[PDB]
Amino acid sequence: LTNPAGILDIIGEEMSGALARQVDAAVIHNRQSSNGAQLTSGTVSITAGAPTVE
């Protein structure tokens, strides 16, 4: 009822982007974007077992 600064008007795009960021965080890094921790799921990311150049 307050809608402090029109903040409730952005939640659809903010949540659309939160899902998109988590697709990249899963596929690239094997992590949960809300926590930064590694996923316990059986999926493999691009960074898992790829060789590193320093």
């Binding site: 600064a5 029109g6 982007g17 998109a20 960021r21 697709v23 990249d24 596929v27 690239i28």
Partner: peptide
């Protein structure tokens, strides 16, 4: 006077659906 225009960063795009 509270501005209708916010200070907020853009968020990072997802690249994986494009780059696969």
């Amino acid at each position: 006077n509270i501005s209708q225009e916010w200070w907020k960063k853009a968020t990072e795009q997802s690249i994986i659906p494009t780059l696969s």
